[PDB]
Amino acid sequence: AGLLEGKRILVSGIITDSSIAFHIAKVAQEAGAQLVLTGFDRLRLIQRIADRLPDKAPLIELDVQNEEHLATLAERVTAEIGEGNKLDGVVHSIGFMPQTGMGTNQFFDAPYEDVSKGIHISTYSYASLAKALLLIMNSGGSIVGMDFDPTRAMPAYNWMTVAKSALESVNRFVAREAGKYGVRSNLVAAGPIRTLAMSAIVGGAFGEEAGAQMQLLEEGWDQRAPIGWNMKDPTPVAKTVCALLSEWLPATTGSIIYADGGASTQLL
Template sequence: MSDLLKGKKILVMGVANKRSIAWGCSQMMMENGAELIFTYQNDRIKKSLSRLVSEEEKLVECDVSDDASIENAFKLVNERFGKVDGILHAIAFANKEELGGEIMQASREGYALAQDISAYSLIAVAKYGREILNDPSSIVTLTYFGSERAIPNYNVMGVAKASLEASVRYLARDMAKYGTRVNAISAGAIKTLAVTGIKGHSELLKMSEERTVDGESVTIREVGGTCAFLMSDLSIGVVGDVIYVDKGVHLI
């Protein structure tokens, strides 16, 4: 363990299970000395998260589709732990039927849902998070190359990730006055619960692996290393950026 994040408290939003990129980020932050607090959406996610996090008081319910839920969750975090030094936003969702075929088949409701949960939630988290974030502090979110390229079947999620990345830039501008820097990590394709919801995900994972510089997929811990850096004071000059952690897939 290093002391890169010693004394820092980080709020982690979006761990679903041990394969989650958010869990890889959590592992690396803990190994670098951070104290972590976790949010969960519902009892099902809480049950899964409890297998990874034994301290009940470090689990806080939060549904990012509900502003009141976010506000209440952050108030509870502040009451239990005081102000935090960072927030990891690792939350995205789209209906499975929107992740296949042609983009024109996307429903208006499905498109709006993907935008709400995957992109607007970052703005909401920043809005209420401002009250519990120290100066300096860091917000990190997770995106994917499908924001820039038309990845097969990614569809409304790709559009939502493009919106998320634009939100990072605007939030970085507006949160700077509060001492909070905002950045995104564009992670390579990894077999997570979210990826398995995409039609043809096996082919996507294989194609991504073949395009890495060493022929091996990036791991959740490798993504986590960059997250730990962005949460640390070493990244104080990195603002409003998207950092690729995909072993070079985006180069081709």
């Protein structure tokens, strides 16, 4: 009946029911989309979580650092959606920085191999997902990735912030490639969301000083946001992703849509 009626959309990045991708998928399905899901390592976990979505969607394995997974992805998706059908959307909702690159650990103490792995997964992979799927996307199509505003430095997020600055740069280059297919590429810069990992972090999993810093950042965020911000509700974020997946933002690419309560637009 709705926003994404008849669109075929791949959604990556579901790990638990609190993953922002889980909510992107739920809202996408409620809006009439047919999904193909992608998951990384804990596939039995992902299967039982994904089984709680509004409707069943095939689940495909994808480790973004695995060249063979990427090489086979388009065939695997085409098998899953039916030959002669293509994708109208791709959601990249994936990120990771080793523990040395976030929290307590001194900014200067992250080894490059840790940083490099974080940038592989968190940035480069946006270009490799695009490289793999563009050949099977329809004109009018939409690639969307998850971002957080890295224009300013901050405590705790450290090398993950750097990875996001790279990711934003990648998005602008992907947009040049995607545009040849009549496909758009954009990021959604969310406000902070209480995933399992972020709850653990605030709980002090990466040191308590880091937990305390993120707690302040979260409180300040809701204060700054002219419409407020609820870090326990990824729905407004999922809806924004769907807006980009729809045809109602046909002239936007290489860009960033801030789904953050308007916090980034206010000093205080």
